[PDB]
Structure formats: C-alpha cells, structure tokens
Write an enzyme that holds these catalytic residues in place. Sequence first.
Site, short mmCIF file in Angstrom:
data_model
loop_
_atom_site.label_atom_id
_atom_site.label_comp_id
_atom_site.label_asym_id
_atom_site.label_seq_id
_atom_site.Cartn_x
_atom_site.Cartn_y
_atom_site.Cartn_z
N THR F 1 46.64 41.28 31.78
CA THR F 1 45.12 41.23 31.83
C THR F 1 44.69 41.52 33.26
OG1 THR F 1 45.02 39.49 30.05
CG2 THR F 1 43.06 39.82 31.44
N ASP F 17 41.05 46.15 31.13
CA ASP F 17 41.91 46.46 30.06
C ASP F 17 41.31 46.04 28.80
OD1 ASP F 17 42.53 43.54 31.04
OD2 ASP F 17 44.01 43.74 29.38
N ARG F 19 43.71 45.05 25.92
CA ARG F 19 44.78 44.42 25.26
C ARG F 19 44.51 42.95 25.43
NH1 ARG F 19 51.23 44.99 26.14
NH2 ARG F 19 50.93 46.70 24.48
N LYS F 33 36.53 42.81 27.14
CA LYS F 33 36.52 41.65 27.97
C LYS F 33 35.22 41.68 28.72
CE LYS F 33 41.52 41.28 28.11
NZ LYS F 33 41.62 42.30 27.03
N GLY F 47 41.14 34.62 31.15
CA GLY F 47 41.55 33.28 30.89
C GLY F 47 41.28 33.09 29.42
N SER F 129 45.79 37.84 34.96
CA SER F 129 47.14 37.38 35.16
C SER F 129 47.86 38.53 35.80
CB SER F 129 47.83 36.99 33.86
OG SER F 129 47.73 38.04 32.91
N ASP F 166 52.47 44.47 34.38
CA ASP F 166 52.10 43.21 33.90
C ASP F 166 52.21 43.39 32.36
OD1 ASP F 166 50.87 40.54 34.75
OD2 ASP F 166 49.56 41.13 33.10
N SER F 169 48.99 43.15 30.17
CA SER F 169 47.95 44.09 30.28
C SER F 169 48.37 45.40 29.66
CB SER F 169 47.44 44.45 31.81
OG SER F 169 46.24 45.11 31.81
#
Lengths: 222, 212, 232, 195, 231, 226, 196, 242, 204
Positions: F1, F17, F19, F33, F47, F129, F166, F169
């Site tokens: 993320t 992103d 996902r 998001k 989060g 993250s 990551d 993501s």
Amino acid sequence: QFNPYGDNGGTILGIAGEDFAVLAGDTRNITDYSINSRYEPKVFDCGDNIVMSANGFAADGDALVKRFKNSVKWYHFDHNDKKLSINSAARNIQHLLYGKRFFPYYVHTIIAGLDEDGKGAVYSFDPVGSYEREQCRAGGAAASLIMPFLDNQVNFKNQYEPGTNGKVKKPLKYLSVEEVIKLVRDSFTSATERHIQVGDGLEILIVTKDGVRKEFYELKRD
Amino acid sequence: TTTLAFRFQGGIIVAVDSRATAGNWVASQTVKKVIEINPFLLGTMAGGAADCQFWETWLGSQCRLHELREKERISVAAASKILSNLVYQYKGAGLSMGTMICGYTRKEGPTIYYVDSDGTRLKGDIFCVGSGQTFAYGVLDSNYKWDLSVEDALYLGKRSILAAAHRDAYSGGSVNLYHVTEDGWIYHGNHDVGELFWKVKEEEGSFNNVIG
Amino acid sequence: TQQPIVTGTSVISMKYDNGVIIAADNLGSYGSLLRFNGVERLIPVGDNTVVGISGDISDMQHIERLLKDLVTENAYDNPLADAEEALEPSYIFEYLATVMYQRRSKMNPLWNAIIVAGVQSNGDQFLRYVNLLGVTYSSPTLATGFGAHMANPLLRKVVDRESDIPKTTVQVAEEAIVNAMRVLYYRDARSSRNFSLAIIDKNTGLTFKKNLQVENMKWDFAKDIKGYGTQK
Amino acid sequence: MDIILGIRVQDSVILASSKAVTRGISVLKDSDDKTRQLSPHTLMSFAGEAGDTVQFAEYIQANIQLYSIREDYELSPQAVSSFVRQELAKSIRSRRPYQVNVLIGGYDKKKNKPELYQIDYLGTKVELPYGAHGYSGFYTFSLLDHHYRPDMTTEEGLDLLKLCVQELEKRMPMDFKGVIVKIVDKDGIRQVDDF
Amino acid sequence: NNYDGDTVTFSPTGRLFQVEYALEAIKQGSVTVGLRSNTHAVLVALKRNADELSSYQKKIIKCDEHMGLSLAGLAPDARVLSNYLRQQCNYSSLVFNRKLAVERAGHLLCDKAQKNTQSYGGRPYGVGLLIIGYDKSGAHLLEFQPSGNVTELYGTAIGARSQGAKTYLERTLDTFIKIDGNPDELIKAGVEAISQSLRDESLTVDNLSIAIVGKDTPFTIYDGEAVAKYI
Amino acid sequence: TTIVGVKFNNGVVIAADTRSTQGPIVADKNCAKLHRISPKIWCAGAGTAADTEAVTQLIGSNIELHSLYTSREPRVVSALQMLKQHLFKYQGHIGAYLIVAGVDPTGSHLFSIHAHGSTDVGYYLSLGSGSLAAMAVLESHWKQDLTKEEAIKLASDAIQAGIWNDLGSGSNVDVCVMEIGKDAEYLRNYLTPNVREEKQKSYKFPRGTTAVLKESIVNICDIQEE
Amino acid sequence: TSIMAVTFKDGVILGADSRTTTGAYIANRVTDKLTRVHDKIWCCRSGSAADTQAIADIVQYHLELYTSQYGTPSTETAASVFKELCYENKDNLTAGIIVAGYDDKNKGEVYTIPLGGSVHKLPYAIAGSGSTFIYGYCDKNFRENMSKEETVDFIKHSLSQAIKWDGSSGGVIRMVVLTAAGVERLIFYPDEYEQL
Amino acid sequence: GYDLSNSVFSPDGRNFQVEYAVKAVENGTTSIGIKCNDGVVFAVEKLITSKLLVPQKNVKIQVVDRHIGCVYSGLIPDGRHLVNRGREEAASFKKLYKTPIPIPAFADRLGQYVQAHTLYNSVRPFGVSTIFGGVDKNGAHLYMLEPSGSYWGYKGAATGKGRQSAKAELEKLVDHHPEGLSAREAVKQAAKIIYLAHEDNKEKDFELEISWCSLSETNGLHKFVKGDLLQEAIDFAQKEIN
Amino acid sequence: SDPSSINGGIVVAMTGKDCVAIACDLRLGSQSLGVSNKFEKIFHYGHVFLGITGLATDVTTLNEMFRYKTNLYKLKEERAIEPETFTQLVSSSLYERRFGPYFVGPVVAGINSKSGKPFIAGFDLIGCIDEAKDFIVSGTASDQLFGMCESLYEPNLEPEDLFETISQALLNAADRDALSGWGAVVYIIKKDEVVKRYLKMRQD
C-alpha cells in the site's frame, strides 16, 4: 498502581463485667518497623456511657469514630434527648460498615458500656459488618496471644474440681472490678514481649454508670 | 460452619453449631447463627457472616411491612423470592450467601427454601449447607422418618451436628436447637459440643475411632 | 492511577518549650536526574503555622493553592474575624486531612505527606502528621519520607517524651535540626545542600530563616581506607 | 449442564428435564423440575447457568402471559420463541451475561402442527425434528437420527426417548436419576409419571 | 394581584409586598425576648396553648451544645431553617475542627432567604428566628427577619407586644451589661422583660420556657420545674 | 500500500495503488483509496480500510454543510482540524493515516495526520506500509518547484517502486492532480502493470455436470391480483 | 527531541530542532515544534507528538479569548494554563512544554512544566529526550546575563552537543527571538555548525 | 401594563420592572467611592436606629478576594447575595490563571450576571447599586453598577438618599484638584461629604465606617480604617459642619 | 475461539452477463456438533439479495435488523430499495457498533432496475464497501474460494454457464472445510425470475 489500605497495628481488649465494662488497648502506632507515635490514643469515649475503639488501619479507624460521634448528636436532636442504648448502637454501626463494603473497611470495632439491665456489654465486629455479643473478646494484632489466656482466667475454661478427675466444672467466677484491673495489665505485659506491635502505653477506659474513669498505666518501651 | 434443617410431621428441626473461624484459628465460640427474621421465620448464617446477618435483618423489615399492608404475615415462598432478587443483583458485583429460610405456615405446611449467592431458589425436605455439609448429610439421611416423634427428632438433630463437629475443622463450639411449629419457634437450649460428646459416646457406644 | 513522578526528600521537625521548629531541604528530584534546584517545600499559612509538604511537587502545587484559599475564606466578615477568628494549626490540619482522605477513597490519591507545625491561640504546641492513606497522628518528634527513620531517631534522642519538652531550650532544638540535615545530606542519595528553616514561637511569632547551608562536614578519613578491602 | 432432550413426534413434542440438581459438590435436591409452562400449549424447559436459570425462567412466563391476557388469545410457539430469542440476544451484548439454553416446544392449533425449537445461549433460533443442548446432545443426536421416521405415533415417541434415557445413563460420567417427562399435545399439556 | 403579586414584582414603591406579608406571620405569633451580657446569653420564650386539653408549643430548638435558636412564627417554616443551621455546624466540626460561629451563620442563612425571593415560584419563610451562642469571639444575639437581615443587638424582641419588651430593655440596658458570671440575674431580668408583654396570660412555670448559654456553662434548655427559681 | 503526496509549484499531486489486501489473501484487485472530502480537496487513506472510508465520509458531510454556511469554497485546514479533533476523542482506537492535500484561493497545502492525533507538514509525505519504498525514490529525484508533467512522472514512478518491493502494493496507479484556480483532473489507470495472462484453456462446463436435488422458483416480484 | 530556552538581557531566545522520530523511522526531518499560542508567548513542544499538539490548541483557544475580553495575558498567565491541563490529565498525557515569553516590563521569562505538571520559573530550561545530555554543558558555560549575539552562539553550540549524542535530534536548528522589537526566526543548516 | 414580566418591552423604550428597581435603591443610605490616584476609599453610613444595637460589629462593607472592596446599598440581603456570587467568580479566576482577578475583568463578570436576570422570566431583577473598585497592577479603578446591569467608569460615584448632595460635593473636590488627591487625605473627605449628605436625613443618628485599598498605605490589600485614624476622620467632619 | 468459527458459513457470489448469482451452504454448528443441515443464510429484501456469514446469532439478529430499516425506506419513498442504496445501508449499520462490534461478513448481490446493471459488493467485520464487478466471497472458507473461483471464472458468463461454475466452485471448497458444507443452495438471479435449486453433494 495504588492500593489504599495500610496498617497501623495495635491491639484491643474488651472484657465485659456484670456491673461494668472495660475497654483497654495499647497506644503504640507503627507502620512496618518504624515507630510512628508512642502515645496517641486509639481508644475513645463517645459520650453517654458508650466507648468506642476501631483498631486495625488508622485511616479508616478515624473516619468510623467521627461518623459515630455524629450519630450521637443527631439522636439527641431528632429523638428529643432519649438515651442511646448499647444494643441500638451495635446495629447502627453495622449499617455504617455495610454501606461501604464494595469498598472495604479494614478495622475491627469493639464498643462497650452499660445497657438497661446494668450489665456489662461488649459487641465485637468483623470488618465487612456483622456483630456478636460476647463476654470477652480480643482484637487487633496481638489478639491471639491475649484471647486463649483471657478465656482461661475469666471464664475458667478447661478447669475442673480437684480429685474427681474432670466430672464437675470448677465453679464460675463472680467478677469484680479490682481483680479485673490487675488482670488486664498482667496479660498485656506478656503480649508486649512476645509481640512487637504492642507496647509503650496502655489506656484503660472504665465504664461505670457513675461516669467514665480514665486510668493510664505505662508499660515497658522494650 | 454447617447449617441444616429438616421437615417432619411435627414441624422443622433447625440445628446449628456455634463455632466460626477466621484465618485458621477460632474467632468466636459463641457465634450463634440463628438469625431471627421474624417470630415465624428463622434464617441460617453460612457463607459470609456480614452479608448473611445484615440481609436477613432487613428481610424482617419487608416481612413486618407486608404484614401491615395485607394484614396476614408473609408466606415462606414469598419471603424467599424477596431475598433471591436482592442477592441476584449483586451478582457480578460479588456477594456471598448460603441461607435456608425455614418457615411453617398454614397455607403451605412446613417449607424450606434454600437461597444461594448464585440466585438458585430450590425447594426440598433436607438441606445441609456449609463447609462440613457432607458429614451432616450422612447421619441425617440414614435415620430419616416422616413418621417421627418430637423427642427423637431433637436427638437426631444433635447427632448430625456432632458428626459435623467431629470431622469438620470449622464446626463445633456449641449447639443450638429450635423447633419451628406453626405457632413459631421454641428454644431448646445451648448444649456444649465438648460436654455433649461424652454422653453420646456413653449411650450409643459410638465414636470407636476415639480412644476411651 | 497516580504514582510518584517528581519528588522531594524529607521534612524533619521537633517540639521545644515555647514552640516548634520545622525545616525541609530544597530539592526537586526527577529520579536520579536532580532536575530542579532551589525549590522550597516549606509554605507559611497564617503567621504561626508552617505547612511543609513532601511527596510530589506536582500534587504540592495544588495543595499550596488550597492553603491560600482557606486564609481568604476565614478572613471574610468582621475585622474581629481575622484578629482572633483566624486559622489555627489544628484547623489547617483538618482541612488538609479531609481532602486527601476523600481523594484516596475515590482512588486517585494526592500523593503527599504533610506536617503542620504551629502554636495555638491558647498557647500550646501542635506538631502533627497526615499522609496519602489518611492516617493521622501526633508525636513530640516527627518527620516524613526517608527521614521517618533516619533523622527522626536523632531528634527523638533529644526529647524522648512530652515532659522533657520544658527542659529542652530553643538553642538545643536549633542544634538537633542542623545536625540531622547533615546526616540526611550524608547518607541519602537525593538530598540538597540548601535547606529552608522556620521557627514558630508564641512570643514573637514566625521568623523564616531561608537558605541556610549545611556546613561542618567530615571527609578527612576517606583517604586512609582504599579498595573493597582487597587492594591497598 | 444436564439432561434436556426433545423429539418432534407427528403430533407432539416430548420434552424431558433432569431431576438431579447439584450446586456445589453435593446433590442437594433430586425431584426438582426445570420447566415452566408458558401458555396452555407451549412449554419451555431450560438449562444453563446456576441461578440465572431460575430467575430468567420466571421472567419469560410473566411477559408472555402479560401479552396473553391483553388479547384474550395466545401467541403461536413461533411467536414466543422469537421473544425468548430477542431477549437473550440483548443479553450477550449487555453488561451482565445470561446464559440460558432453551428448547421451546408447542402445539400450534392454528398451523395444526407440533413445533419444536432450540435456542442456544448466543441467540440462534432453529426449527428441528429433534434437539438437545449440552453434554447430553453429543451422544443422542446421532442416536435419534438412526431410528427415527417422519411420522411416528405418540407412544412410539415415548419408547424411543426411553432408549435415549437408558443409553445416557451408561455413558455419562454424571448421574441424573432419571428424567421427568412431559408431553405437549393438542389435547393439552400433561405429564407421564412413567420414567 | 396588581403590583402586589408573587415573588417577581416591583411595585412603584421599591417594595416587594411578599416581605411585609410574611412579617405578619411573626406578628400573629407569640412573643419571645432575647438579651445578652458579655458572659451569658439568655432567651425567655412564651409558649402558647391551643386549648387546656392541648399542650404548649415548643418555642426553643437546640442547634448545638453552644448554639441555639428560638422561633417566632410558623412552625413548619422554622423546621426547614433549623435543620439547616445544625447541618452546617456539624459540617464545620467535621471539616475545620471548629465551632460554627454565630455571626458567620447569619451570613450563611442570609443568602438562603434571598434565593426564594430571587426565584419565581418561591416564597420568603414566615418565621423569624433569634439565634444565640457562645463562641471563641464571645456572646452574640442575632435577630433574623423574613427579609433576610441579620443584625447584632444587646437585647431585642419579635412577636406581639415586642415594643413593650424593648422599652423595658432600654431603661435597664447598662445594668445587665455590667453583670457578668452571675447567669441568675440575667434570667430574672428577662422574666421581668416579658412581663410587659402579657396578654393577661400570666407568668407561669410551664408557660415560660428558658434556654441559656454561658462561657462556663453549655447550652441548656430549662422547662417544666427548672424555671421555678425565677418564677 | 503506497500512497504518496507530492507538492510542486502550481499545485499538489496525489497518487495511490488500487490493490487492497486483507492478510495473506488479496481481497480485491480494484477499489480506490482516494476519497473526496471536497471537489478540489482530495484525500487518500491507508491502514484499516473501514476506519478510513467512514472517517472521510463522516467529516466529508460536515465540511460541505460549512461550505454552504459560509457560502464559500472549503479550505484545506477546515477538513484538517476537524479530522484531528475527532480521532483524538477515542484516543487512537481508530487507525487512520490519511494524506490530506488540496488547493484553494490561499494556496497549496499538504498535511499528513496519524492515528492518535499527530500532524506533520512537508513537501513530499507518504503513508501506507509500502511508504518506506516510496520515500527512497522521492528523496533523491525531488527538487523545489516542479512542473505538472514532471510532478505526475515522479508520483507514478514512486508508487511503482512501491509495487515491486512491497507485497501488499500493486495494481493500477491512479492520480488526481490539484492545481490552483483550475479544476481537479482524475486520471484513473494512468499506467497499468500487473496484467493477468490468458488461461491455458477455458473451464466452461456443460449442463448437468453438477447434480441437482430438486427445483423450485423464488418469486421476487411484488404481490399482485391472482 | 531536544527543546531549550534561555533568557538574555533584552529577551529570551527559544531553540528547538526538527528531527522527530517514531521508532527508528524519521517521519519528517524538517519539522517545526516552536509554536505560536498568542503573539509574544511562544512555546516549545517535546513529548508525545499527539498529546503536545492536542494540549497546545486548547491553550491557543483559552488565551485568545483572554485577549478579547480582558487584555493580553502574561507569560505567568499562559504557564498556569499549561499546568492546569497537565495536572488534571496527568494520568494519561505525557507532555512537557516549555513556555517562554516576553512580558513588556519583565523582559523574557522561562517557565517549564513537567509531565506531572507544575510551574517552575528558571534562568534557562531544557527538557526533551536528547537534552539530558547537555545538562553539564549548559550549566558550566552559562553566564547569567548575555548579549543578543552571545546568546545565539551559546544556544547553537548547546543544541550541537545534544544533536551529536541523540539520534532523535538532528536536522536543521530552529530559533525564535522574542524581544520588544519583534519576532525573528533564525535557522542553521548542519554544515554551518558541524565544522565548529 | 408592562410589569407582567422582566422580558417585556414598552413602546417608550422602557422596561417598567427594572426602572422600578431603582426606587428600591433610592431608599438605601449614602455610600461613596473616592477614586484617588493611590487607590480607593470607600465609606458607608451605618444607621443606629436603636440604642439597643452593638456599634461597629456589623459591616456593610465586605471584600471580595483580598483587593476588591464592594459596598452596596438598596436591599441589604440582596447585595449580600450579589457580593457572595462574585467571591465564587473571583476564586475561579485565581485557580485557573494563578493571578487575582483584574478589576476591569471582575467588572464584566458581575455586570453580565445582573443583565442575565432580565432575559429570563424565571428570576427577579436585583434591586441594588453596588460600588466596587480597588488597586490592581494596571492601577486603581472605580465602578458603579446599576440594578439594570449597566456600568461606567467614575472619578467619583455615590448612591443613597443623600446622593444629590454627595455627587455635588464630589464635583467641588475634583475642581479643587484636577490632578486628584491622596487616599491618605481622602479618609478625612469621605467623613466630610457623608455628613452634609445627612442634613436631608438628620432624623436618625449614625456611625461612620471608612475603608481603603491603597498601594501606598495598605499595600494593595483592602483593609479597614480603624483606631485613632477613624476617630480623627469623624472629628474632622464635625468641625467642618460647625 | 474466533466468533465467526463457531458455526462457519460461506457465501460466494459472481457476476455474469444479464444475471448475478449468490450461493451458500446450510450448516449451522455449535462448534464440532452439527445442529442443522438446513438453515438458509441468504434472505431477500425486494430484488436485492443479502447474504450473511460470520457468527451464529448474528445471522439471525442482523437479518431482522435489516427487516426493520428496509421497511422504513419502502413505506416512505414508495419504491423497493435499489442495489447500491442497500450496500450503503449495510455499511452504515455495521459501523453503528465499532465498540462491541458485529461479526458477520455480508455480500450484496443485485441488479439495478433503473439501468439494468449488475452490482455486487462485499464486506468485512467492521464493515467497508469492497468493490468488485468480478467476484466477492465471504465466510470462513473464503480463502479456499478466492482461488477456486479465480481459476474457473471467465468474463462475461452466460446464465446457465454461470450455474455450473458457481456450483462446482462451492462444492469443492466446502468439502475441503469442516465447518461448511452438508448441502448447498444456489440462486441464479436474472432480471425477472430467480430460481432456487438445492444441490446434491457430500453430506459427510
């Protein structure tokens, strides 16, 4: 973390007569091994021939005495100066305790005086409430050295006529105040050696129907 | 600490011991557990002494006041199901109880209801509650007659309290007996457990565990 | 709930013939870090009563306030009502007492120990203790904190009982309170060299001797022993 | 927990409850019932937690009968069942937990079919042809499935239920001193003293 | 009900008429006389029977063992304030370890009268109290009105024939101030005071009710045949 | 993320992103998001997904109330200070990490707000993250004043560093470019990697290859005359 | 996080850095922790990042309303505020603020408020978590009474010893100068004092 | 007919209730406040209306905090309540800010509370004029507060029955000294102007009470004038009237 | 234990061309004991279909919670509720408790009547919209499903292509699970007629 309960130690002794009652206790006040005060009473007169000690943890002991001496003023006020009996006082205290049990009190209370038959009275109490009339009961730290001795010498326990080999109880003791005064002090002088939360000063309040007698007696500071 | 009461045809023998403790030493040996709720209701202090004694005295407030309004004193079912709710609220707030309310009314005959800290209200004919209730149960149930004299019924009373005294650590001291009739309880003395012991060993030959 | 954050050391005190002496050292410790210096924990209320507050400075501030407010309450109504219906040591005691207790009961304590030292309108000594349990007691010698059994033993060796009080003179009392500060300053790890001192007398009232220094120390003999007893 | 079994017979629900009552470590009573008739044609039996059971059981008889006398007609077992569900549902969210597992059995004379319901302590209603809670449930659910038929006469439902009693006694480490039997039927709510 | 209404009205005379009206409560009441010295206070109260099978109506209430009040006017009104004075005295004994002084208690009381004149749906109390005591600042005698005014006096009265008691006390005023540590003398001069305030109801040893307070003596109430030494 | 928020001279550009994960499983390969406090003050959240979307809705409604009540365009702070206050009330039992960015008459802004009630300001911020992986490319390539075209290539390639390094993501890269005194442009799917390959055969089954037990019809149409 | 304030003859100069970690991860390295709550009563924040920002809005609010009805509050006045929020929420708020400000008459003054919350006036105050290391360096080389030029070099070097030893302190050094004359921010990048 | 409630308006701009409350204050007794340069001097006339009274044992001048005198006339119990409220409000300030309440800040708390009682039908308007001032660190001040919840600054203020006379003598004294006079010297002038203000009202007999908050002699705390000073002030006035 | 895993329950749902489909199992256990082999966990409020999973009781409570609110909308605005508005409502209801939260995982399946378009949504425990227009599944063998469905699914499925896919996908997943299975009931939702078919599959 906070824990609101301590200890201030000390011991009391209520010995009910047949024409008096005697409430005595040590005036030493301790918090662990430090001596807080030599001489500062834990034994109080509460007016109109009832005496009061709440011994255990001092911080509570204070508060519970102060509400009792309030409930005297309020009786005189709303009942038109009626005398407040030992018997009625005993119950009235138990409400005082019970009301905060969810938050516990940690003092043993012995009240004494004379009631309307003119006999000695002692009521002793457990911390979370309840009371029982007994002729003698000890309480506080050093109680259990005091009590089986007191039950031997007053009530003549496990004593029997000679030469019949335990088939007749030794005849019961008629109390009088002078034997009783000697006795209190002899018992205490022993507790004070063997138990380290007792000593210094001894304050014997005597109740008679003629008025309240204050006889102080020193002990060893050992 | 052991309490018991039994139905028979003459009423309710209610028997108690007079010893309680605190810690590991005997705190009082005169501690009477017969709590007069009313002249027609006896309640039996086991569990927390404080909680029991106070609440049974206040039960007698609501027995006296019911009797003023309806002009007829409380039924044993009705008094018990006052106590049960009270207790029940102080559930999850922490309480201790273990009473039997024993009563004889003329609309319900003898009745005993057992109330507990949990809030059970159970009916029954023999209730032994306490630390030594296993030692009571036995001597009581093995000599159980509905056809029973009032003289034997006392003597049965005594011997179930002396079993209870002999084996329980915390029972003994003295014995109180009350026989509840319809016309209310009459008091049958205070008999020391110490003093009782040697007369029953003398009669029945029992207690062949303890040396002569 | 509440626990000690920023703390003072010890308040010491004793009775003498015509009054009381009470003194406290001037330190605000933040654990090992001695964060605050020159912080005074003797607080005068009235003009014959010094109230010395021990435990946390945090909580102390909010009791320092209540003493000033009490003097304001009392002073109300008549001009005879501040001349001779003034606050007494025994009145001040009870006021502090009663608040602390109720804050302990609601489980959020005012973490202090307090000594209220004064003299009466009747002309008598009063030296008394209260704390964060609500324990009260009076004695002819008193202290709080670590001096409860460090300094206190020395003071109680001068005046053992309440009848040895008319035989002890104000200059012998004076000596014992200096001497016992020096013993504190030695043998306790949170102590400051600075101390405030008060004398409450019933013939001249309150004289406040501020910022005395602990003088006359021994340190001569720590050059005659060496190691842990293994290396000379 | 103890014995509490249902079997949905063609025309009736046969419920059975334990005699034994153990609070502490001593059986104190052994003829007690655990059932209270709600309405003339709905019986409710309960087991769960001690003392929670006795109070909460009196609570439902009270409320359902309150409504009965308002409308001079009686609720269907489906409708009473939903009320009991509703309450216990609020109670696992609420401060003090109740914990009462109930089999509500009734004969609805308006659907003309016997109805049996199992309400667990969490608050899940389910219609069933046989049911049970707790410890007993684990041995019997499979035993009743074996021998059952869709339509069985009343005295066949008794015989089966006494096979289930008999089995239980061997296998359970607990002692229950036989059940009390009650039939809830279209001809009223009666007991059978035969065990 | 014009300007003469409930407790919210002015009234083009700066009055409120609710205050004058409650002061007729007092007038319709039985007479009472207070007088003090520098060492003793004394209240001398005339009780009033309703009939000869009825008793006499208590006129003096003990607040403390050094503080007392005696009413004149409506008895139900008195009982709301009397409870109040005893309640803040025990409060002052608990919190401050101190007796609740007479002068300060007059100030506490004062504001308790005020807010039922402040608020609509209120009424003034129709009782006036005389409040004596002995404290650490000595003897005080307060006269409390339905107005809420507290005033300090050497000797006063309220009742019917209150004028006649005050004229006796205007002559003999400087005599009783220089009598001190002799309580007996003050008691008798107040018997004598209430003599000029008779409706021919007589001085009688069960009509008159005394209560005293000393420097050297608690609050004590004399009634029945404790009053015969003066009468 | 990875969700970046990068200021440049003429406005602020925010990328994300798409996902959205729930533990080791990818729940959804396509949600967004990016939320909308207001029309020219976009925000994205990271989060616990529920606690982002609900906090953005909740406070979204109240700044629009206000914006009518002043009869004025909303300001970035207006949203930002309401946020701050709300999350603090529960003491961070709500777990939001939102980049709030936007333009208004009184200039470009860009804040970040953490779950307790902390707030910081920079010129390049990142939450998520994957945030760490963004941040690395951001600190080298960035420089004071960018143009619009440069700012969208920095933004996108910062999320891609995120994607690659990551796990949590991936998916498309959205952009929403906010520039002072011209409308806000949503460029959904700007650059799309992570295209799924064609199956090796299809898995279509003929009728009756799963058993049926019985049949009925459920009637969802309203109750009518029979 | 290192915060200090030092009084000088014509005012007070406040000093903070700009590195603010949570974990090992530096959130923003250009962070501003020297905050306006009035117009001549400025504060320095250290402690829990949420709890300082929270408290400090609440004081901003009380003080500005104080201005609008009563006239400007004093340094004294503002310091009391911050104590009265720490003391009543000492059970769950970890905040140590330094309230430094210029009264007209009394020049610059410093008050520091512990975590437990209490006034202390000081000739200079330090608190944070990287300002524990410079208690000895400030104390010895502190001259009571300095000039404007002397003061800034003293505080620059005090913050450099604090930076060197604390990995939660670094970045540029921010200073606010509060004098009658006005309000002046100064800033030092690292190349400018890591040479000294 | 616009006296039904205290929220009503009249078409002549009047609010009949509130204006009638001024009739209540005119039946008071003479009370002055002297705004001096060093501080303030309050004085109140205390009538001896009977010889049975204990002189100098009743105060009508009570301090609120320690540096704000408050002296009132009109309804004496009602003023004891308005003084009582401003001790609560004053103490709240001291707790919350650790500074004793400023005199212009205190002016607002009291003013606002009196204004409030004409916006609700639930309460009665207060029938008093209260006069308060003291020394703060932004100097000495004086305020006169109306029963209407109105106030203004004053260089001298008065209220009572002899208020025509007082306000008049106070213009003479501000025309003697354009630069104003000492609070030391003002003890003797409060005595003088209550005495001329009692020729209208000379039926009765009175005791003079005087108080001051000055920076120069009582160190900013509000104390009573007493002793030889008090009885000299009385003597001053008496020679002036003879 | 975990609240969702005390009866089990799965819901799968997929979109087609002019049709959606939703499907559940029928198991209600109380831990290891299977209590009933029938209990519909899909319910339908108008032409929206609501799938409910997670914790045992909360299937029942939360269903009739939506009974009450759907009613208020239908009574007032004088129309049946559209797929999208009901998705919003579920999101709002789940959040109403966040301290003492629900423990369920709804699946909204419907086809809009205002534009003739498929619309599906998913949810978590605390509740948030989880968009897809491909597939959503929920439950406790949701993990096993997520794969199964992906392999099998093909964009744009025909009405009775869509039936074989979802029936197989569910069958295989549930018998690789303990706490779901014991029979399965598949709805095929068209634009005019929804067909209810129970599926013959492993009981054991």
